[PDB]
Design an enzyme around this catalytic site. Structure first.
Site, PDB file in Angstrom:
ATOM      1  CE1 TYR A  99      -4.927   6.036  12.335  1.00  0.00           C
ATOM      2  CE2 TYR A  99      -6.708   7.643  12.340  1.00  0.00           C
ATOM      3  CZ  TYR A  99      -5.565   7.105  11.768  1.00  0.00           C
ATOM      4  OH  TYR A  99      -5.014   7.627  10.639  1.00  0.00           O
TER       5      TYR A  99
ATOM      6  NE  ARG B 148      -3.507  -0.425   2.841  1.00  0.00           N
ATOM      7  CZ  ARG B 148      -4.748  -0.033   2.544  1.00  0.00           C
ATOM      8  NH1 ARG B 148      -5.471  -0.648   1.626  1.00  0.00           N
ATOM      9  NH2 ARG B 148      -5.294   1.010   3.171  1.00  0.00           N
TER      10      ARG B 148
ATOM     11  CE  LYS C 166      -1.877   7.972  11.504  1.00  0.00           C
ATOM     12  NZ  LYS C 166      -0.523   7.489  11.138  1.00  0.00           N
TER      13      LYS C 166
ATOM     14  CG  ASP D 225      -6.014  10.824   9.363  1.00  0.00           C
ATOM     15  OD1 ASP D 225      -6.669  11.553   8.570  1.00  0.00           O
ATOM     16  OD2 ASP D 225      -6.396   9.713   9.769  1.00  0.00           O
TER      17      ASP D 225
ATOM     18  CG  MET E 288      -6.626  10.033  21.844  1.00  0.00           C
ATOM     19  SD  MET E 288      -7.086   8.921  23.183  1.00  0.00           S
ATOM     20  CE  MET E 288      -5.713   9.203  24.312  1.00  0.00           C
TER      21      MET E 288
HETATM   22  N1  LIG Z   1      -5.118   4.816   3.599  1.00  0.00           N
HETATM   23  C1  LIG Z   1      -5.608   6.030   3.936  1.00  0.00           C
HETATM   24  O1  LIG Z   1      -6.664   6.431   3.438  1.00  0.00           O
HETATM   25  C2  LIG Z   1      -4.939   6.927   4.953  1.00  0.00           C
HETATM   26  C3  LIG Z   1      -5.610   8.078   5.434  1.00  0.00           C
HETATM   27  C4  LIG Z   1      -4.954   8.861   6.383  1.00  0.00           C
HETATM   28  C5  LIG Z   1      -3.671   8.524   6.837  1.00  0.00           C
HETATM   29  N2  LIG Z   1      -3.074   7.433   6.383  1.00  0.00           N
HETATM   30  C6  LIG Z   1      -1.774   7.071   6.918  1.00  0.00           C
HETATM   31  O2  LIG Z   1      -0.818   6.737   5.895  1.00  0.00           O
HETATM   32  C7  LIG Z   1      -0.020   5.657   6.379  1.00  0.00           C
HETATM   33  C8  LIG Z   1      -0.207   4.551   5.406  1.00  0.00           C
HETATM   34  O3  LIG Z   1      -1.572   4.151   5.250  1.00  0.00           O
HETATM   35  P1  LIG Z   1      -1.980   2.647   4.810  1.00  0.00           P
HETATM   36  O4  LIG Z   1      -3.484   2.606   4.611  1.00  0.00           O
HETATM   37  O5  LIG Z   1      -1.034   2.221   3.724  1.00  0.00           O
HETATM   38  O6  LIG Z   1      -1.597   1.785   6.117  1.00  0.00           O
HETATM   39  P2  LIG Z   1      -2.056   0.250   6.461  1.00  0.00           P
HETATM   40  O7  LIG Z   1      -1.921  -0.510   5.169  1.00  0.00           O
HETATM   41  O8  LIG Z   1      -3.304   0.311   7.290  1.00  0.00           O
HETATM   42  O9  LIG Z   1      -0.844  -0.097   7.446  1.00  0.00           O
HETATM   43  C9  LIG Z   1       0.491  -0.064   6.946  1.00  0.00           C
HETATM   44  C10 LIG Z   1       1.317  -1.150   7.609  1.00  0.00           C
HETATM   45  O10 LIG Z   1       1.396  -0.885   9.003  1.00  0.00           O
HETATM   46  C11 LIG Z   1       1.921  -2.010   9.587  1.00  0.00           C
HETATM   47  N3  LIG Z   1       1.491  -2.268  10.956  1.00  0.00           N
HETATM   48  C12 LIG Z   1       0.260  -2.363  11.460  1.00  0.00           C
HETATM   49  N4  LIG Z   1       0.364  -2.733  12.770  1.00  0.00           N
HETATM   50  C13 LIG Z   1       1.657  -2.888  13.076  1.00  0.00           C
HETATM   51  C14 LIG Z   1       2.425  -3.243  14.247  1.00  0.00           C
HETATM   52  N5  LIG Z   1       1.830  -3.555  15.417  1.00  0.00           N
HETATM   53  N6  LIG Z   1       3.767  -3.272  14.130  1.00  0.00           N
HETATM   54  C15 LIG Z   1       4.388  -2.969  12.959  1.00  0.00           C
HETATM   55  N7  LIG Z   1       3.738  -2.604  11.832  1.00  0.00           N
HETATM   56  C16 LIG Z   1       2.389  -2.548  11.874  1.00  0.00           C
HETATM   57  C17 LIG Z   1       1.422  -3.222   8.744  1.00  0.00           C
HETATM   58  O11 LIG Z   1       2.506  -4.115   8.453  1.00  0.00           O
HETATM   59  P3  LIG Z   1       2.322  -5.673   7.933  1.00  0.00           P
HETATM   60  O12 LIG Z   1       1.368  -5.592   6.791  1.00  0.00           O
HETATM   61  O13 LIG Z   1       3.723  -5.989   7.547  1.00  0.00           O
HETATM   62  O14 LIG Z   1       1.833  -6.385   9.187  1.00  0.00           O
HETATM   63  C18 LIG Z   1       0.803  -2.598   7.490  1.00  0.00           C
HETATM   64  O15 LIG Z   1       1.235  -3.185   6.236  1.00  0.00           O
HETATM   65  C19 LIG Z   1      -0.507   5.279   7.768  1.00  0.00           C
HETATM   66  O16 LIG Z   1       0.231   5.917   8.787  1.00  0.00           O
HETATM   67  C20 LIG Z   1      -1.917   5.835   7.786  1.00  0.00           C
HETATM   68  O17 LIG Z   1      -2.374   6.067   9.118  1.00  0.00           O
HETATM   69  C21 LIG Z   1      -3.682   6.642   5.470  1.00  0.00           C
HETATM   70  N1  LIG Z   2      -3.028   2.792   9.293  1.00  0.00           N
HETATM   71  C1  LIG Z   2      -4.113   3.241   8.591  1.00  0.00           C
HETATM   72  N2  LIG Z   2      -4.608   4.488   8.833  1.00  0.00           N
HETATM   73  C2  LIG Z   2      -5.646   4.928   8.164  1.00  0.00           C
HETATM   74  N3  LIG Z   2      -6.080   6.231   8.503  1.00  0.00           N
HETATM   75  C3  LIG Z   2      -6.220   4.116   7.181  1.00  0.00           C
HETATM   76  C4  LIG Z   2      -7.257   4.176   6.302  1.00  0.00           C
HETATM   77  C5  LIG Z   2      -8.148   5.346   6.171  1.00  0.00           C
HETATM   78  C6  LIG Z   2      -9.258   5.100   5.199  1.00  0.00           C
HETATM   79  C7  LIG Z   2     -10.318   6.071   5.524  1.00  0.00           C
HETATM   80  C8  LIG Z   2     -10.049   7.414   5.358  1.00  0.00           C
HETATM   81  C9  LIG Z   2     -11.023   8.378   5.672  1.00  0.00           C
HETATM   82  C10 LIG Z   2     -12.262   7.962   6.160  1.00  0.00           C
HETATM   83  C11 LIG Z   2     -12.517   6.600   6.345  1.00  0.00           C
HETATM   84  C12 LIG Z   2     -11.542   5.650   6.014  1.00  0.00           C
HETATM   85  C13 LIG Z   2      -7.321   2.955   5.587  1.00  0.00           C
HETATM   86  N4  LIG Z   2      -6.338   2.169   5.994  1.00  0.00           N
HETATM   87  C14 LIG Z   2      -5.672   2.856   6.953  1.00  0.00           C
HETATM   88  N5  LIG Z   2      -4.628   2.443   7.658  1.00  0.00           N
END
Ligand SMILES: NC(=O)c1ccc[n+]([C@@H]2O[C@H](COP(=O)([O-])OP(=O)(O)OC[C@H]3O[C@@H](n4cnc5c(N)ncnc54)[C@H](OP(=O)(O)O)[C@@H]3O)[C@@H](O)[C@H]2O)c1
Ligand SMILES: Nc1nc(N)c2c(CCc3ccccc3)c[nH]c2n1
Ligand SMILES: NC(=O)c1ccc[n+]([C@@H]2O[C@H](COP(=O)([O-])OP(=O)(O)OC[C@H]3O[C@@H](n4cnc5c(N)ncnc54)[C@H](OP(=O)(O)O)[C@@H]3O)[C@@H](O)[C@H]2O)c1
Ligand SMILES: NC(=O)c1ccc[n+]([C@@H]2O[C@H](COP(=O)([O-])OP(=O)(O)OC[C@H]3O[C@@H](n4cnc5c(N)ncnc54)[C@H](OP(=O)(O)O)[C@@H]3O)[C@@H](O)[C@H]2O)c1
Ligand SMILES: NC(=O)c1ccc[n+]([C@@H]2O[C@H](COP(=O)([O-])OP(=O)(O)OC[C@H]3O[C@@H](n4cnc5c(N)ncnc54)[C@H](OP(=O)(O)O)[C@@H]3O)[C@@H](O)[C@H]2O)c1
Ligand SMILES: Nc1nc(N)c2c(CCc3ccccc3)c[nH]c2n1
Ligand SMILES: Nc1nc(N)c2c(CCc3ccccc3)c[nH]c2n1
Ligand SMILES: Nc1nc(N)c2c(CCc3ccccc3)c[nH]c2n1
Lengths: 252, 251, 252, 250
Positions: free
Chosen positions: D156, D13, D160, D143, D158
């Site tokens: 979560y 991702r 961030k 975020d 808190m």
């Molecule tokens: N996706 C969104 O819409 C969104 C929105 C706002 C912010 N963000 C931020 O952008 C970043 C990336 O988002 P994402 O959706 O790609 O993240 P994600 O896929 O939910 O998580 C990324 C990775 O975090 C690792 N992880 C989870 N728990 C863990 C633990 N206890 N120890 C070590 N690693 C751990 C996992 O590793 P493994 O798979 O190797 O277990 C997972 O592949 C995150 O910080 C997220 O909060 C994302």
């Molecule tokens: N570690 C991590 N943090 C996150 N904030 C996400 C998300 C966010 C996806 C989402 C983003 C806005 C509203 C509802 C869901 C999807 N996967 C994520 N993983």
């Protein structure tokens, strides 16, 4: 002797509720108004019936122009004329209507003058005159808007004006602190809805509010103003209190 | 074909650096100026020497007045006339001086200049820019990282910059359906005022955590370039601080 | 019948002043303490002398651990056992000391103490308070920090804890609004300085405050807590009120 | 000699996209992962095929515990062991799930996972990074919705918020060492694997700029900018990459 307050756009709605509460608290009040003469005089009459010679009205357009500084100076002077002092300034008067970026019969120059003049420039000039004219608890409260970072579509000039007012609140708090003048704000989310809004659209807004699914009453806004002018807020300056029932925390 | 950008107040200092960098990236540029005609032209000469017919100048006062809307329409029109398109607007031109609350320009002239240059002209230019689009279109507003910890006696200037933040957000929301992004760059201490005494300059430099120096105009321009680029195509309503940590420093 | 409040870290300084003002307003109080047993008991005795059976003490470490949830549940339970109700929670208790990023407690203990007291215990106390709640005026007030965006050097874990507390205030305001539980904060700038701090160092800070070149009293902080829990703030939730004399508006 | 970056949670991702872009830009990368062993190894293989000896994997649980400091130190050490330097730390790994305030993991575990991954580990990684020390910087994945959070995501959120605090406090404190500390704040990017498609489309429809989620690569683009020479005066900044989502009222 009783302290005195100027409330701008105090004929109706939130401004009236602020004037009334300040009056109930013991203030003498200048009820500023623009077009709502009948309502302004009816309010003053009521307050004077409660305690004689404690309310006067004061008419002024707060649209930006080369004479706006004189008009703002005369509002403050009217409080000193009537009551011999001016302890509190509440900047409440405000134009509010859309100004779409891409296209009434108002020219853009007029929309700028009204929306920026009422929401920002008049507050600034009134703040200058208030400070220039100066035991005591002097303060200014600006009526802001809790939704300025998640604004309604097509209200850019209104939003610009409210942001500028946040800026004035902070700059003035800083600059007037050495004079013992505190400068704060109160930021409603949804309070009294526009008279022209239909009930269905009102309800749509109401239902977005986490705390009670309803708009703030005028009195609830006024309660926050009265706190900030009181001796319970004597160390508070440059603060803006949201009074929004949680609305600004709700995602799209 | 080459996209075109308008930079307001582009004859000197940060606006010049932004114009130069856009041009180096492949843009054709409108160099707007008010009083700095000699400098605007010298810049245009330098850019046109590199690539013929890729730089024009455009004069206008951005003081708020009855004629400001027509002046702003014409700034946008000049880009369409010179280059046949207008892809980027940079709102950089800005008046900056103190307006003490308690005590020569009259106060109503101070309002017109400070609020006109920093907020109303950007609004009007924004309207004109969008109206001509009624591709990677964007607007960048030059904001200020210190708006919440403002310099003493700069109320109107600060009001203007706060209004500019409001416009950035409102316009980002409203122009998103047109694919027009709207963002900001917020310097802390960059090029200090020419009139500021040298010792006062060093006092400000000493406050900056990252290097104890001001940002060069080019480092400001770098953030502008990012924002207009294809690397920022999902970014709108964002204000990027470029301040070396200054705004994080307590009193 | 009288409402009841839990104030954490209430034996001294700001927490004590909060407890006293709440009590003066008509609340029965749980005075939570960690190490300051004598001061906590002294306060309870003083309040019970005013009105019998209106103050109890509750001892607990609010450092993060496996037992922290049960400890927080027990604090809330103590208020119900004492008074049959729990209307107000004030999260005041807080560890505060530097944790430099670069080079006698271990880092894992610093994490536990600073993040536990400033964030995790407030969260757990918030769950337990709401769980027991699923003309009332229920609310939570979190003691935040006006300077979190201009933090002191080398206080990163403390700063992290306080930012987390802002996040809790917002998240809990949103989530608890349907239950009628409001969640707000009070953010002091410079209030009571550390007891050991030399006057000359206290004065460096006092001189930075625009409004009166002095720190806030504990009582002035308490005044803002009193407003937020009152009937005059019944539409206010998710709001943090700075009580900082303009300190946070002052550039470097 | 080429710079090296640690990217946490880089197997999939957004973290994967960041590792790929850093690598295309000329970095050697430590691909940290927790459970995604197979995806991590496969990425390292793909990257080393393009430039040999430029990628390694490193396994670590980033849940809060008394050994988390050791684990964080070991992640940084792994970068030095493989590449002799560590120029960039990307704090990306993150737990994300609801923790309602009113009633199979215990609350103890929910605190450990949500606060550890989003805040404490970034802090400890930042300590170890700085202690082991050119264009050095840290980028934290924040975020954009932290002030308009999802219902029942208090822990979560808190975590961030704490991460914003760390970004600021570390930018201040590490600036004398020339280490910049910034953030990138997505709104809606790659939606959860577990989320239903109806709900995914609900979120897409809210984004003013294109009514679509950010791609991983669009998020990585902002990371690349912050570590680059074009961001040398930028520290303590958080760049939203949200298509205007956080501007949209309820
Ligand atoms: N996706 C969104 O819409 C969104 C929105 C706002 C912010 N963000 C931020 O952008 C970043 C990336 O988002 P994402 O959706 O790609 O993240 P994600 O896929 O939910 O998580 C990324 C990775 O975090 C690792 N992880 C989870 N728990 C863990 C633990 N206890 N120890 C070590 N690693 C751990 C996992 O590793 P493994 O798979 O190797 O277990 C997972 O592949 C995150 O910080 C997220 O909060 C994302
Ligand atoms: N570690 C991590 N943090 C996150 N904030 C996400 C998300 C966010 C996806 C989402 C983003 C806005 C509203 C509802 C869901 C999807 N996967 C994520 N993983
Ligand atoms: N209502 C809400 O939900 C809400 C939400 C956010 C913020 N606020 C803020 O709270 C304050 C009060 O709101 P409201 O709804 O009570 O305000 P309002 O009814 O829209 O306006 C208040 C008064 O402003 C005066 N005004 C308008 N244009 C003027 C001009 N050119 N010169 C002088 N005065 C002028 C009018 O006086 P006359 O009637 O005498 O002409 C009017 O009565 C405003 O500052 C507003 O922006 C309200
Ligand atoms: N320098 C800093 O440290 C700093 C810090 C924070 C924010 N900023 C922001 O960054 C931007 C650029 O800063 P700067 O220091 O380069 O700006 P500047 O030199 O003060 O001004 C840039 C130009 O603005 C134009 N201008 C001024 N008044 C005008 C008017 N009435 N009508 C039309 N144009 C007018 C002038 O053009 P002519 O010369 O052609 O008359 C001037 O050269 C500004 O928006 C500023 O507010 C700068
Ligand atoms: N003073 C200021 O200028 C200032 C500025 C900004 C914010 N604030 C905030 O306002 C609140 C009051 O400040 P203050 O200066 O009055 O606080 P303080 O005196 O530093 O701390 C208050 C109490 O916190 C309790 N505490 C500390 N560690 C604990 C633990 N591990 N478990 C349980 N309780 C623990 C202690 O209880 P015992 O004494 O019983 O051990 C202590 O009396 C705090 O949240 C603080 O962060 C204060
Ligand atoms: N001067 C002035 N300013 C205002 N902000 C208002 C309102 C706002 C009512 C409203 C509040 C939130 C969403 C939609 C409508 C209603 N009437 C107003 N008058
Ligand atoms: N239009 C305009 N706006 C500005 N904000 C400036 C400056 C700012 C210089 C300065 C930046 C931070 C603290 C003290 C001074 C210098 N020149 C400027 N011109
Ligand atoms: N739990 C806790 N938190 C705090 N923030 C404090 C203080 C802060 C005193 C101070 C406040 C502003 C600048 C320098 C010092 C003093 N004692 C404190 N205790």
């Amino acid at each position: 002797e009783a302290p005195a307050a100027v409330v701008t756009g105090a004929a109706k709605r939130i401004g009236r509720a602020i004037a009334v509460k300040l009056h109930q608290t013991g203030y003498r009040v200048v009820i500023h108004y623009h077009n709502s003469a009948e309502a302004a005089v009816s309010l003053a009459d009521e307050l004077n019936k409660e305690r004689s010679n404690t309310a006067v009205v004061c008419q002024a357009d707060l649209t930006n122009s080369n004479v706006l500084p004189a008009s703002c100076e005369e509002i403050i002077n009217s409080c000193f004329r009537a009551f011999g002092r001016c302890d509190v300034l509440v900047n409440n008067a405000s134009a509010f209507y859309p100004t779409p970026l891409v296209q009434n019969g108002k020219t853009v120059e007029t929309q700028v003058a009204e929306l920026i003049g009422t929401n920002a420039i008049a507050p600034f000039l009134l703040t200058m005159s208030f400070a220039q004219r100066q035991s005591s608890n002097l303060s200014i409260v600006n009526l802001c808007d809790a939704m300025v970072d998640q604004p309604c579509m097509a209200f850019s000039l209104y939003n610009m004006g409210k942001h500028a007012l946040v800026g004035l609140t902070q700059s003035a708090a800083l600059e007037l602190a050495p004079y013992g003048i505190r400068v704060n704000g109160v930021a409603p989310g949804v309070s009294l809805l526009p008279v022209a809004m239909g009930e269905e659209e009102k309800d749509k807004w109401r239902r977005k509010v986490p705390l009670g699914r309803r708009e703030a009453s005028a009195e609830q806004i006024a309660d926050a103003v009265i706190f900030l002018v009181s001796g319970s807020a004597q160390y508070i300056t440059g603060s803006i209190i949201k009074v929004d029932g949680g609305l600004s925390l709700v995602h799209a």
